[PDB]
DNA sequence: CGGCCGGGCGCCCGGCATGGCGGCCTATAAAAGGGC
DNA sequence: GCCCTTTTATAGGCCGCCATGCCGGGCGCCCGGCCG
C-alpha cells in the first residue's frame, strides 16, 4: 500500500454507423480542422468537457482528454449529436475505452539501473528514444513507465481500478532502489 | 516608414486592448488634424479586414468606423466618396473564404452606420430625383444582405449553444442599413423576411424590431406577425430554432406587452408548455426560454393575465406552474442549470401575491441539496445567493412561518451538511434516500463521496458552503425551536470523524457570524472553549487508512525478522487484529504509538538476539525496512497534525466571532496562526486570514495592547518568508556589482541537489499567501485610521529604513551575520505588500519614505538595490503622479552618471521593474525614460547592456503612438514642464526638423571649414544621445581638429554645470586618446594650440618613468598613449574610469583575435570614437570587430553576424548574371549598409577638396615568354601558401616584367635623357632585381635612390626630404608596406606598381604618397601586368574587395542619414500516442502540425450583444 | 646619471586546399503491418 | 506462409563547415650599453 495514482488522460472510440464525408465537416464548421496531406482525419474540439475528437471517413470516432468514464461518455455522445446536426445520419451505439494514462510522482529519485539489473526479465533501460525505463508488466496488463526523476506513468489499462492494482504491486520493488 | 504607417501597424500587433484602443484613437484624431488625406489612411487600415485573425479584424472594423466619424456627410443639394470601397466590400460579402466575408460585413456595418444617409447620391440632380438613387442603393444592399442571410453556412458548435458569426454580423449590418431607408422599403423587407420564416434568417427580425419602433406603431399587423412567427418558433423541433426564436422576445417585451390581451395571454401559455416539455440531455435552448419567462413574468400586466387565468382555471395557476421548473435544477448542461436558478431567484423578488404560493418547504430542501451536490463554482455561488434571498423574505414574513415551513426537513439536511468527506480510496457515501427528487416528494458520484474523481478542494468547498447556508436559517429560527438543530450540531461537534467535527465548527461559525447580536450564541461558549484547549483524542475515524498502512509496514518488518533474520518465533510481539478508530474497536486495538515503540524498541530487542553473525547481512534489509516504517509513521502523524490544526482553527474563528477572548489569549492566537502557516486549501485559509484581522481589531479596540502588538508583528514576519520575493541578506551581503533581476539566469536558484528545496518553495508561498491577505484585509478594515492605532506597523515600515539611509550606511549593515541587514531588506517588502491596498489618506506617509527608498536605490549592496528597485516600482505604480515626479527629478538624471557604476545599475534596474509592474499604463511617461534607456543600451557593463536591451525591446513599440497622448488628469507642474522639454529634446531625433549647427564655444579657435563644421555637428549629434560611431574620413581632412572641438566642448560643458549645481554625476574625469606612437607629438602640439585650457599628459615613456604615474594619471584632462604600450599596460590603465575614448587608427583593432584588440575592448569609457582612414579592407567581419568595440549589443554576436553577412558576401566571388549566388550578396550588402549607415561618416578627399591635384590611372600590359610558361606548367603538374609564394616569385635580362618597366621608364625624361618617378615593389628581392639591372645595364643614366625597411628610422627623414626637394634624384625605389603614416613623397610625378598586393586599401594608401595635399601637378599612376598570369587573379580579387568596401558605405552626410535609428538599434510530461497502439515515439502527426489553442468564447459576447450595438446606433 | 645606439624578440599581416568533423537524404538492410 | 510499404538504421557521397598551415616584411617596446 502507499500513495494513490491519479488519472490524466482517457481515450474512447465509437463506430458511428455511416460513411460520412470529411470536407463538408471542414467547410461548414469553424470548430473543425482538416487536411489529408498532413493527417488522415478531421479533428474537432469542444469546450465544456475540454476534449478533442477525431472523425474518420469510415465513421469511426476517437475521443481524447476526458478525465473520467462518464465524462468521456458525455463528450462522445455530445460529438455524436453534433455530427448528426450537420445533416449526416448517425447513431451512437457502440462505446469502448482504448487507453488510460495514470500518473504519479514517487517521493524519491531512483537509481533505475538496478531496476534493469534485478528485473530485466521484464524491465528494459534504453535511452535511445525516450527518457527513463519501460516495464511491460503482464498482470495486470499495463505498459508501465518510470522516469529517473521518480515520475511514474501507467499506460494501456482498460478499467479504472487496474491502474491502482498495478501501482500497488510495482511500488514495493521500486522502493528498493533509492 | 512614416509615423502613420508605423502607428497603423499597431492595430494588427499590440500588447493589449489599452494600447490598440489608444492607437485607433490617435489615428482618428490625427485624421481630424489632416482631413484632406483620408484615403491615405483608409487604404492602409482596410487590408486588415481580410486578416486571418478575428481579434485584429474587429479592431480594424472599429478603426474604419472611428476614423470616418470626422469626415463630413456628402450632400449635392446643399461621386459618393466611398463608392470604390463599398463596391469592393459588397463583393467580398460573397467571398468563398470565411474570414473575408466576416470582415466585409463588419466594415459595411461601420460605413453604413456613419455615412449611410448620403449613400449612392449623384452630383447635379435635385433632391427629389437623387433620393430615388439613395433609396434604390440602400434597398440593393439590403437585398444582398438578405441573400447572404438565406445562404449563410459557416457556424460554430464549439460550445453547448451554437452560434453563426457570419449570420450575426450580416444581421447587424442589415439592422444598420434599414435605419436609414423609408418605411415604404422597410415593409418590403419585413414581408420578405416573414416569408423567410416559412433554414430561416430569423435574426433579421430581432434587429428589425430592435432598431425601428415606428413600425410597431404603424400597424398592429407587424407585431402580430412577428410574434405569430415567434410562437410557431418556440414549439419547433430543432432546439437551435427554439433558442433563436426565444431570444427575439427578450429585448422587446416592454414595447410588446400592450398590443392586445389575447396575444400575450396565449404567448405566455405556449412559453409555459414548451418549458414543461422535458428537455434532452444535450439541448441548451431551455436556458434561454428561462430568461424569456423571467422577463415576461416581471411586468405587472403579465401577472394580471396569469391571475385571471388562475381565477378561470386552477390548473393554470402560478402556484402550480412554477414547480414545473424544478426538474431542470440538476440538468447536465451547465448553462441551463444556472439559468433556472436565475429565473427562480427573479421569481423570489416578485412581491407577495406571486411568491406565497410556491415558496414552501420543498424548494428550500431542493435548493439545499442542490448546493451540497454542486461542483461548478458559478452555479454553487448563484444557488447560495438564491437560498439567501428565499430565506430572507420567508423570515421577513415572520420567524414562526419559516420554522413551521422548514422544520419538516431539519433532520435529513442537518445530517447531510455534517456528512464527512473521508480519504480517497475509502469514501463514506451519502445516504441516497435523503436526496428527494424534484418530480416527486448520472452525476451521483458526488453523493458517493468519490474523492478520486473530485478533489478534496471541491468537497471541502461544498461542506463549508452548506454550513454557510444553514447557519443563516439557524439565525432566523426562533430560539426556543432550535432543539432539533442544536442537539444535532452539538453532537456532531464531538463526532469521531474529523470532517464532521470541523463542519460542526463551521456551522456554528456561520450562525454566530450573521446572528443579529452576539450574546444570542452564548450557549455554545463552553463546548467551543473545551475543543480549543483540551488535549485532543488520539484517533480519528477518517484517518484509519494511514494507521492501517503503518500496521502493514510493521507486519512486514516482523515477518522479515523470520524470513531474513531467521528469528525463531514464539517470542515476537503480537500486532493486533483491529486498528484504532475503526468501529467497535476497543482500547487494546493497534495504535500509532504502539507502532512507534515497536519500530525502535522491539527492533533493537530482536537485534540483540537474532541469528548470530548473520546480523551483518540481515542488517541492510532490516535497516531499509526500519527506514520505511519511519517514513510512513511520521507521514501519518503529520496527517493527524494537519487535521487537528484545521479543526482547532475552525473552532477559534467561531469563538472570536462570538466575541470571547480569554484572559491569556495564547491558545487562540496559536490556533489561528499555525493554521495560517499550514492549511493549503485556499477557500479554508481565507477564513482564518480574515478572522485574525477581526481579532486584531477587537483586541486593539478593547484597550489591550500586548496581544495585538505581538500578533501583528508575527504576521508581518510571516509576510516575508518567501525567499523568491524577499531575498536572504545573509546569502547576498557580500555580492556587489551584480543585478539580481538578471540573476534568474544563474544556476542554483532551484537547488537541484535536494528535493527539500521544492518542499520549502511550496511551504513558503503557502504561508505568504495567507499572511499577505491577512494584512490586506486588516488595511481594508482600518482604512484611514491604520497607522494611528497599530503603532508597530509604522515602526517596522519606517524606522529601520530611517536609521539605515538617513546618512551613510552604518557598518552594522554590511555583516551577513548581523540582524540589522535583514531588517531593512524586510521593511521594503512590508511596504511593497502594504501600499497597493493602503487607504488613500495614508499616501502622504508612503511618499515621505520615497526620499529614503530612492537613497537606498543608490547604495553599494546589490540586494539593497534589488529590493529598492522593486519597492520603488510598486510605490510609483500605485501612487503615480507624486512617485513619478520624484523619480523623474531624482534618479532619472543619475542614469547617465559615468563616474561610478553602483548608481547606474540601480537607475536601470528601477526602470526594468517599473516597466514590468506598471504594464501598459506607462504611456503617459514613456517619453521621459526612452532615451536614457537608449543611452544605456550601449553601455560598458554587460549587465546594464542586457537589462537595457531587454527593456528597450518593449519600450520601443509604445513610442510611435505616444506623440499626442493626453496628459494625466492630476499632474505636477515640475513634470509637465519636463514633458515639454523631453518632447522637444527627442523631436530632433524623431524627424528632420533638426537643430541648427552646434555652437562650438569661442574658447576653441573659430577657424572651421564647411565640411569640418558638418562633422563637428554630427559628432555633437552623437554626443547628445550617447551614440557612438566612426569618423571614417580620408587623410588630409582636419579630423584632429573636429575631434578636439567636440572633446573640448564636452569637457567645458561638463565643467560649468558641475560648478553651477551640486551633482556628482558631472564632476570631471580624464579622457584618453590612443594613437600610433609617432603621432603623439602631433596630437600634443595640436591640442596645445587649438584647445589651450586642457591639461595633457603623455603616458608613453621609459618604463621606469612610466611606473611613476600609477595614481597621478587621473589628474589630467586628456591622456595620450601608444597602442603598443597599451597592450602591455592595459592592466593598470583599465582600472580608471574615463570620458570620450578616442582611437586614432581603427586598422590596428580590426581583427578580433589580435591581442591589441582584446586589450582595447576591455576599457570602460563614457563615449567612444574611432578616426580610421578606411573601415573595410578585406571583409565585413573586420567591421564587426570595430562595432564590437563601439557598441557590443548593436551588430549582434560574432558568428551570427558571420552567418548573416560574411558568408553571403563571400558567395559573390564568381557571381553570374541574375543568379542567386549574386543576389544573396546583393541583398547582404544593402542589408548591412542600412544598419551601419547612421554611425559611419565617409567623405572622399577627391570630392570635398579641389585644392589637391587631379589624378589619372592607367594599366600597362606585357607578354608571357616560352621559358616562363614552361616553368609554370612544370610546377602546375606537381599547403597552398608554398605554391602561391613560389608562383609569385617565378612569374618575375629576358623576363617580361623587367622589359615592360624598362620600356616604360624610357618613355620618360629619366630614360631618354625634369621628371620624377616612384617604383613600388612588394618583395625586397624584386626591388633588388630592378635595382641591379635597370641602372646597372639597361638605363644607367637614371639617378636612383632607395628607401625600404632596411633603412633605419634615424635617416629615413633625411633621405625622403632630400628626394622630394632635390631635382637631381630621378627615381626612388621603395616597398609599399614601409612607413605608411606620414612618408612625405609628395614631390613625385608618377607612381609605378611593378607588383600587386591582396589588400586594396594598402594600394590606395601607397598611391596617397604622391596624391597628397602638398602637390598641384597631376598624379599619373601605372600598374604593370603580364597577360594571363596570376597577376590578373590578384587584380580581380582586389577589384571585388574594393567594390564591397565602397558600396557598403557609399554616400554619407550628417543630414542624409536616416531618422529611424530606433528601428535598427533594437536588433507535456508524457505523450503516449492515442491514434494507435500505445507507444512513446515523442512526435505524432495530428496535433504537431499547428493545431494550436482553442479561442476564448468571450469575443462573441463582446461583439454580438444587442445593447451595445443599439447604443452605438443612437 | 639621462640621452641615444644597437641588438633583440615579439606581434600582425595574407591567400585557399585539406583534413577532420558532422549531418543532409537515400542505399542495402531490418522489423512490423496491409493485403492475399 | 510470402510480397511490398512504412518507419528506422549504419553506411555512402557529398553539402557545409571549422581551424589550421607560412615566410617574407614591417613596426615597435624593451634591454644592455656608450654617448656627454
Amino acid at each position: 500500500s502507499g500513495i494513490t495514482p491519479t488519472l490524466q488522460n482517457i481515450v474512447a472510440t465509437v463506430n458511428l454507423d455511416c460513411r460520412l464525408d470529411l470536407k463538408t465537416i471542414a467547410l461548414h464548421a469553424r470548430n473543425a480542422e482538416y487536411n489529408p496531406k498532413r493527417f488522415a482525419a478531421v479533428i474537432m474540439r469542444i469546450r465544456e468537457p475540454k476534449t478533442t475528437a477525431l472523425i474518420f471517413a469510415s465513421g469511426k470516432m476517437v475521443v481524447t482528454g476526458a478525465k473520467s468514464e462518464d465524462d468521456s461518455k458525455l463528450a462522445s455522445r455530445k460529438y455524436a449529436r453534433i455530427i448528426q446536426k450537420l445533416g449526416f445520419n448517425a447513431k451512437f451505439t457502440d462505446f469502448k475505452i482504448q487507453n488510460i494514462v495514470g500518473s504519479c510522482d514517487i517521493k524519491f529519485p531512483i537509481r533505475l539501473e538496478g531496476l534493469a539489473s534485478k528485473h530485466h526479465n521484464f524491465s528494459s533501460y534504453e535511452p535511445e528514444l525516450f527518457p527513463g525505463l519501460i516495464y511491460r508488466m503482464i498482470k495486470p496488463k499495463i505498459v508501465l513507465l518510470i522516469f529517473v526523476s521518480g515520475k511514474i506513468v501507467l499506460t494501456g489499462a482498460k478499467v479504472r481500478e487496474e491502474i491502482y492494482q498495478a501501482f500497488e504491486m510495482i511500488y514495493p520493488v521500486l522502493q528498493d532502489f533509492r | 516608414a512614416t509615423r502613420l504607417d508605423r502607428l497603423v501597424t499597431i492595430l494588427e500587433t499590440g500588447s493589449t486592448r489599452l494600447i490598440r484602443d489608444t492607437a485607433v484613437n490617435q489615428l482618428a484624431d490625427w485624421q481630424k488634424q489632416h482631413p484632406e488625406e483620408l484615403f491615405n489612411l483608409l487604404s492602409r487600415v482596410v487590408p486588415y479586414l481580410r486578416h486571418k485573425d478575428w481579434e485584429t479584424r474587429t479592431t480594424a472594423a472599429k478603426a474604419i468606423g472611428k476614423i470616418i466619424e470626422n469626415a463630413p456627410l456628402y450632400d449635392p443639394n446643399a461621386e459618393w466618396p466611398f463608392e470604390r470601397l463599398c463596391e469592393f466590400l459588397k463583393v467580398d460579402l460573397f467571398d468563398p473564404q470565411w474570414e473575408t466575408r466576416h470582415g466585409a460585413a463588419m466594415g459595411l456595418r461601420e460605413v453604413i452606420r456613419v455615412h449611410g444617409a448620403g449613400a449612392g447620391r449623384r452630383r447635379g440632380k435635385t433632391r427629389k430625383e437623387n433620393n430615388d438613387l439613395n433609396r434604390q442603393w440602400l434597398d440593393d444592399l439590403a437585398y444582398r444582405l438578405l441573400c447572404v442571410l438565406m445562404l449563410d453556412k459557416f457556424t460554430d458548435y464549439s460550445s453547448d449553444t451554437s452560434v453563426a458569426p457570419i449570420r450575426e454580423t450580416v444581421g447587424q449590418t442589415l439592422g444598420a442599413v434599414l435605419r436609414h431607408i423609408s418605411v415604404e422599403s422597410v415593409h418590403a423587407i419585413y414581408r420578405l423576411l416573414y416569408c423567410m420564416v416559412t433554414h430561416g434568417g430569423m435574426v433579421g427580425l430581432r434587429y428589425v424590431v430592435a432598431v425601428r419602433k415606428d413600425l410597431l406603431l404603424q400597424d398592429g399587423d407587424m407585431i402580430d406577425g412577428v410574434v405569430r412567427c415567434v410562437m410557431q418558433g418556440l414549439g419547433d423541433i430543432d432546439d437551435d430554432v427554439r433558442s433563436v426564436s426565444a431570444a427575439t422576445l427578450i429585448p422587446m417585451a416592454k414595447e410588446f406587452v400592450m398590443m392586445r390581451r389575447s396575444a400575450l395571454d396565449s404567448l405566455i401559455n405556449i412559453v409555459w408548455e414548451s418549458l414543461s416539455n422535458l428537455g434532452d440531455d444535450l439541448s441548451a435552448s431551455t436556458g434561454k426560454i428561462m430568461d424569456l419567462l423571467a422577463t415576461l413574468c416581471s411586468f405587472p400586466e403579465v401577472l394580471e393575465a396569469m391571475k385571471v387565468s388562475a381565477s378561470q382555471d386552477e390548473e393554470r395557476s402560478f402556484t402550480l406552474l412554477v414547480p414545473r421548473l424544478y426538474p431542470f435544477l440538476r440538468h447536465t448542461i451547465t448553462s441551463v442549470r444556472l439559468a433556472v436558478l436565475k429565473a427562480l431567484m427573479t421569481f423570489a423578488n416578485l412581491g407577495g401575491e406571486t411568491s406565497q404560493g410556491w415558496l414552501n418547504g420543498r424548494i428550500l430542501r431542493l435548493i439545499f441539496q442542490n448546493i451540497i451536490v454542486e461542483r461548478d463554482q458559478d452555479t454553487l455561488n448563484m444557488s447560495l445567493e438564491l437560498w439567501t434571498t428565499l430565506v430572507r423574505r420567508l423570515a421577513a414574513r415572520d420567524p414562526a412561518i419559516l420554522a413551521d415551513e422548514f422544520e419538516a426537513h431539519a433532520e435529513p439536511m442537518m445530517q447531510l451538511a455534517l456528512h464527512p468527506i473521508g480519504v480517497p480510496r475509502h469514501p463514506i457515501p451519502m445516504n441516497p434516500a435523503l436526496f428527494q427528487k424534484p418530480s416527486g416528494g448520472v452525476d451521483g458520484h458526488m453523493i458517493q463521496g468519490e474523492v478520486d474523481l473530485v478533489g478534496v478542494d471541491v468537497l471541502i468547498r461544498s461542506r463549508i458552503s452548506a454550513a454557510k447556508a444553514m447557519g443563516l436559517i439557524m439565525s432566523f429560527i426562533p430560539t426556543p425551536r432550535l432543539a432539533s438543530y442544536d442537539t444535532a450540531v452539538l453532537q456532531a461537534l464531538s463526532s469521531p470523524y474529523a470532517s464532521t467535527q470541523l463542519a460542526a465548527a463551521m456551522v456554528i461559525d456561520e450562525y454566530a457570524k450573521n446572528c443579529s447580536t452576539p450574546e444570542v450564541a452564548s450557549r455554545f461558549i463552553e463546548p467551543l472553549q473545551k475543543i480549543i484547549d483540551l488535549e485532543r483524542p488520539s484517533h480519528y475515524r477518517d484517518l484509519v487508512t494511514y494507521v492501517q498502512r503503518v500496521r502493514s509496514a510493521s507486519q512486514q518488518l516482523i515477518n522479515l525478522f523470520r524470513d531474513h533474520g531467521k528469528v525463531s518465533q514464539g517470542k515476537l510481539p503480537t500486532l493486533a487484529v483491529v486498528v484504532q478508530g475503526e468501529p467497535e474497536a476497543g482500547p487494546g486495538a493497534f495504535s500509532i504509538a504502539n507502532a512507534e515503540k515497536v519500530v525502535n524498541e522491539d527492533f533493537e530487542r530482536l537485534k540483540r538476539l537474532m541469528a548470530p553473525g548473520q546480523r551483518l547481512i540481515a542488517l541492510p534489509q532490516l535497516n531499509e525496512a526500519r527506514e520505511q516504517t519511519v517514513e510512513v509513521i511520521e507521514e501519518a502523524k503529520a496527517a493527524k497534525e494537519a487535521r487537528d490544526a484545521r479543526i482547532k482553527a475552525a473552532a477559534a474563528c467561531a469563538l472570536v466571532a462570538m466575541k470571547v477572548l480569554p484572559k491569556k489569549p495564547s491558545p487562540l492566537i496559536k490556533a489561528i496562526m499555525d493554521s495560517i502557516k499550514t492549511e493549503e486549501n485556499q477557500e479554508l485559509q481565507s477564513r482564518s486570514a480574515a478572522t485574525i484581522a477581526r481579532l486584531v481589531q477587537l483586541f486593539t479596540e478593547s484597550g489591550r495592547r500586548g496581544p495585538a502588538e505581538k500578533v501583528v508583528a508575527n504576521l508581518v514576519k510571516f509576510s516575508c518568508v518567501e525567499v523568491a520575493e524577499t531575498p536572504e541578506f545573509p546569502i547576498h551581503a557580500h555580492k556587489t556589482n551584480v543585478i539580481l533581476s538578471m540573476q534568474k539566469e544563474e544556476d542554483r536558484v532551484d537547488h537541484p541537489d535536494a528535493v527539500k528545496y521544492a518542499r520549502e518553495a511550496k511551504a513558503a508561498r503557502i504561508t505568504r499567501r495567507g499572511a499577505k491577505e491577512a494584512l490586506e484585509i486588516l488595511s481594508k478594515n482600518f482604512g484611514a485610521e491604520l497607522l494611528e492605532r497599530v503603532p508597530t506597523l509604522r515602526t517596522f515600515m519606517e524606522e529601520p529604513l530611517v536609521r539605515a539611509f538617513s546618512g551613510d550606511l552604518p557598518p552594522e549593515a554590511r555583516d551577513p551575520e548581523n540582524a540589522f541587514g535583514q531588517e531593512i531588506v524586510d521593511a521594503m517588502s512590508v511596504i511593497r505588500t502594504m501600499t497597493p491596498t493602503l487607504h488613500p489618506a495614508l499616501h502622504p506617509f508612503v511618499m515621505q519614505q520615497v526620499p529614503l527608498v530612492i537613497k537606498a536605490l543608490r547604495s553599494d549592496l546589490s540586494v539593497f538595490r534589488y529590493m529598492a528597485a522593486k519597492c520603488m516600482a510598486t510605490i510609483c505604480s500605485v501612487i503615480t503622479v507624486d512617485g513619478m515626479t520624484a523619480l523623474v527629478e531624482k534618479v532619472l538624471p543619475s542614469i547617465n552618471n559615468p563616474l561610478d557604476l553602483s548608481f547606474r545599475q540601480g537607475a536601470i534596474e528601477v526602470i526594468y521593474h517599473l516597466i514590468a509592474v506598471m504594464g501598459d499604463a506607462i504611456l503617459p511617461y514613456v517619453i521621459f525614460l526612452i532615451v536614457p534607456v537608449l543611452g544605456r543600451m550601449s553601455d560598458s557593463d554587460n549587465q546594464i547592456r542586457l537589462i537595457a536591451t531587454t527593456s528597450f525591446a518593449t519600450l520601443v513599440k509604445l513610442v510611435p503612438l505616444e506623440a499626442g497622448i493626453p496628459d494625466p488628469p492630476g499632474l505636477s507642474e515640475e513634470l509637465l514642464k519636463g514633458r515639454d522639454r523631453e518632447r522637444t529634446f527627442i523631436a530632433q531625433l524623431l524627424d528632420p526638423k533638426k537643430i541648427e549647427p552646434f555652437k562650438i564655444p569661442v574658447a576653441i579657435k573659430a577657424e572651421l571649414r564647411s565640411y569640418q563644421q558638418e562633422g563637428v555637428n554630427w559628432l555633437a549629434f552623437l554626443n547628445k544621445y550617447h551614440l557612438h560611431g566612426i569618423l571614417c574620413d580620408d587623410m588630409g581632412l582636419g579630423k584632429t581638429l573636429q575631434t578636439i572641438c567636440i572633446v573640448a566642448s564636452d569637457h567645458h560643458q561638463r565643467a560649468e554645470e558641475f560648478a553651477r549645481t551640486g551633482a556628482p554625476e558631472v564632476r570631471k574625469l580624464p579622457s584618453l586618446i590612443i594613437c600610433p606612437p609617432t603621432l603623439s607629438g602631433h596630437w600634443q602640439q595640436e591640442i596645445k594650440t587649438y584647445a589651450p585650457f586642457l591639461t595633457v599628459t603623455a603616458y608613453v615613456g621609459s618604463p621606469a618613468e612610466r611606473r611613476a604615474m600609477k595614481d597621478s594619471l587621473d589628474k589630467t584632462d586628456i591622456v595620450i598613449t601608444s597602442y603598443d604600450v597599451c597592450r602591455n599596460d592595459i592592466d593598470v590603465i583599465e582600472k580608471y574610469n574615463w570620458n570620450y575614448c578616442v582611437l586614432d587608427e581603427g586598422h590596428l583593432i580590426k581583427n578580433p583575435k589580435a591581442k591589441i584588440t582584446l586589450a582595447v575592448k576591455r576599457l570602460t569609457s563614457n563615449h567612444r570614437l574611432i578616426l580610421t582612414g578606411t573601415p573595410i579592407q578585406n571583409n565585413v567581419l573586420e567591421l564587426w570587430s570595430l562595432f564590437d568595440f563601439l557598441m557590443p549589443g548593436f551588430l549582434g554576436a560574432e558568428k551570427v553576424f558571420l552567418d548573416r553577412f560574411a558568408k553571403p558576401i563571400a558567395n559573390s566571388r564568381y557571381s553570374k548574371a541574375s543568379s542567386k549566388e549574386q543576389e544573396a550578396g546583393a541583398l547582404a550588402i544593402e542589408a548591412l549598409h542600412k544598419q551601419v549607415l547612421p554611425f559611419l561618416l565617409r567623405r572622399l578627399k577627391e570630392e570635398v577638396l579641389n585644392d589637391l591635384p587631379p589624378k589619372i590611372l592607367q594599366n600597362y600590359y606585357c607578354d608571357l615568354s616560352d621559358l616562363q610558361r614552361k616553368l609554370f606548367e612544370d610546377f602546375t603538374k606537381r599547403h597552398i601558401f608554398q605554391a602561391l609564394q613560389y608562383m609569385r616569385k617565378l612569374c618575375n635580362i629576358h623576363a617580361p616584367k623587367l622589359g615592360a618597366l624598362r620600356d616604360l621608364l624610357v618613355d620618360c625624361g629619366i630614360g631618354v635623357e625634369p621628371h620624377r618617378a616612384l617604383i613600388f615593389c612588394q618583395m625586397k628581392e624584386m626591388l633588388d632585381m630592378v635595382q641591379n639591372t635597370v641602372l646597372k645595364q639597361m638605363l644607367p643614366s637614371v639617378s636612383y635612390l632607395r628607401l625600404d625597411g632596411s633603412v633605419e628610422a634615424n635617416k629615413r627623414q633625411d633621405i625622403v626630404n632630400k628626394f622630394n626637394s632635390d631635382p637631381s634624384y630621378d627615381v626612388l625605389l621603395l616597398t609599399t608596406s614601409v612607413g605608411g603614416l606620414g612618408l612625405n613623397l609628395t614631390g613625385a610625378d608618377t607612381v609605378i606598381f611593378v607588383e600587386h598586393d591582396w589588400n586594396p586599401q594598402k594600394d590606395l594608401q601607397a598611391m596617397d604618397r604622391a596624391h597628397r595635399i602638398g602637390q598641384k601637378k597631376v598624379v599619373n599612376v601605372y600598374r604593370i601586368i603580364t597577360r594571363g598570369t596570376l597577376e590578373e587573379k590578384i587584380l580581380s580579387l582586389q577589384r571585388f574587395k574594393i567594390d564591397v568596401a565602397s558600396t557598403v558605405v557609399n554616400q554619407q552626410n550628417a543630414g542624409l542619414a536616416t531618422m529611424d535609428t530606433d528601428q535598427i538599434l533594437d536588433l507535456e510530461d508524457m505523450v503516449d500516442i492515442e491514434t494507435g497502439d500505445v507507444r512513446r515515439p515523442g512526435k505524432k502527426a495530428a496535433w504537431l502540425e499547428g493545431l494550436g489553442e482553442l479561442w476564448d468564447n468571450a469575443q462573441y459576447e463582446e461583439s454580438f450583444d444587442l445593447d451595445g450595438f443599439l447604443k452605438t446606433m443612437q
Side-chain angles (χ1 to χ4, degrees), chain B residues 1106 1122 1124 1128 1199 1207 1279 1281-1282 1323-1325 1356 1375 1377-1379 1479:
Chain B
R1106 199 159 76 243
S1122 174
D1124 299 295
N1128 294 12
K1199 217 186 91 70
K1207 279 184 280 147
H1279 291 84
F1281 299 164
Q1282 306 296 348
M1323 290 165 63
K1324 192 163 62 173
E1325 185 190 20
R1356 289 185 188 181
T1375 39
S1377 56
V1378 173
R1479 190 200 165 194

Side-chain angles (χ1 to χ4, degrees), chain B residues 1455-1470:
Chain B
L1456 279 57
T1458 62
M1459 301 302 306
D1460 57 354
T1461 63
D1462 298 321
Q1463 193 268 6
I1464 52 171
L1465 184 50
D1466 64 336
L1467 185 63
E1468 303 296 340
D1469 203 2
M1470 70 307 278

Side-chain angles (χ1 to χ4, degrees), chain A residues 108 115 170-178, chain B residues 556 624-625 628:
Chain A
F108 45 80
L115 284 162
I170 188 73
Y171 172 75
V173 323
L174 79 96
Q175 180 185 315
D176 299 354
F177 299 101
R178 200 283 310 285
Chain B
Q556 187 181 7
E624 189 276 340
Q628 183 66 5

Side-chain angles (χ1 to χ4, degrees), chain B residues 43-261 263-347:
Chain B
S43 293
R44 292 171 197 281
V45 66
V46 164
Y48 295 151
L49 298 183
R50 292 97 186 187
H51 203 282
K52 272 77 78 173
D53 179 20
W54 173 285
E55 174 50 33
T56 175
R57 207 182 306 118
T58 182
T59 207
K62 185 199 277 286
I64 184 162
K66 185 82 75 163
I67 207 169
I68 300 302
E69 297 283 358
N70 308 335
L73 283 65
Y74 178 50
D75 46 353
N77 306 122
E79 55 170 18
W80 146 265
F82 304 87
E83 187 71 350
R84 54 184 155 275
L85 184 144
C86 280
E87 187 66 14
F88 247 85
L89 297 194
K90 199 164 66 172
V91 173
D92 285 6
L93 185 58
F94 291 74
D95 198 318
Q97 300 286 358
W98 169 53
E99 312 294 356
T100 56
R101 260 170 312 116
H102 175 283
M106 205 170 187
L108 265 163
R109 205 281 302 289
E110 289 291 339
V111 168
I112 295 292
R113 178 184 149 266
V114 180
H115 282 169
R121 304 271 184 186
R122 282 289 302 117
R123 192 182 193 78
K125 310 190 78 165
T126 174
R127 56 191 179 238
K128 61 184 174 181
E129 81 198 343
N130 69 69
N131 273 327
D132 181 14
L133 296 183
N134 169 33
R135 191 62 35 73
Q136 175 173 336
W137 194 94
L138 294 165
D139 199 312
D140 170 84
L141 178 57
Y143 187 78
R144 291 270 199 272
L145 294 161
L146 284 162
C147 276
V148 171
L149 276 172
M150 290 179 70
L151 296 171
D152 76 296
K153 219 74 66 177
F154 282 87
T155 62
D156 180 19
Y157 313 98
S158 182
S159 191
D160 53 16
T161 182
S162 68
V163 64
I166 181 57
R167 195 172 74 232
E168 291 290 352
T169 43
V170 300
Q172 284 197 125
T173 300
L174 174 135
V177 76
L178 65 86
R179 183 164 191 269
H180 299 305
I181 64 189
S182 60
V183 175
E184 165 59 7
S185 183
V186 178
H187 271 299
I189 297 297
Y190 177 90
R191 194 180 70 189
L192 199 160
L193 197 46
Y194 181 90
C195 176
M196 204 189 301
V197 175
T198 308
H199 309 83
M202 198 171 292
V203 301
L205 288 178
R206 174 156 54 87
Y207 291 111
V208 165
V209 174
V211 304
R212 293 201 86 101
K213 290 190 292 300
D214 64 347
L215 197 63
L216 69 93
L217 175 63
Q218 202 74 353
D219 57 75
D221 192 9
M222 188 226 75
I223 191 74
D224 296 321
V226 300
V227 131
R228 196 189 301 282
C229 149
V230 170
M231 278 195 304
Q232 289 207 335
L234 281 161
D236 199 3
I237 304 301
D238 190 2
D239 54 7
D240 198 335
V241 172
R242 297 175 76 197
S243 178
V244 70
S245 55
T248 300
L249 273 164
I250 304 178
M252 56 85 74
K254 261 285 175 181
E255 57 266 33
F256 174 79
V257 77
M258 68 292 284
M259 63 182 278
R260 204 186 293 101
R261 184 82 283 191
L264 163 58
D265 200 1
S266 179
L267 179 59
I268 199 77
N269 196 30
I270 177 54
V271 163
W272 272 111
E273 287 197 350
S274 182
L275 184 154
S276 196
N277 188 4
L278 284 170
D280 196 353
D281 290 1
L282 290 150
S283 66
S285 65
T286 297
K288 301 207 79 64
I289 285 173
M290 297 314 310
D291 289 330
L292 170 54
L293 183 54
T295 301
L296 293 183
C297 282
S298 179
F299 303 152
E301 197 155 341
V302 187
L303 277 51
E304 302 299 334
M306 288 190 296
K307 183 169 74 67
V308 299
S309 304
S311 291
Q312 187 183 344
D313 193 354
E314 171 53 22
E315 85 192 11
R316 208 61 44 173
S317 56
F318 195 73
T319 302
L320 179 56
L321 291 177
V322 169
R324 294 173 182 269
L325 272 58
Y326 294 173
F328 294 118
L329 273 167
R330 285 285 296 183
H331 200 197
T332 59
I333 296 287
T334 313
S335 171
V336 304
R337 206 197 304 174
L338 182 138
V340 167
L341 296 164
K342 295 279 282 296
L344 196 140
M345 199 286 298
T346 298
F347 285 6

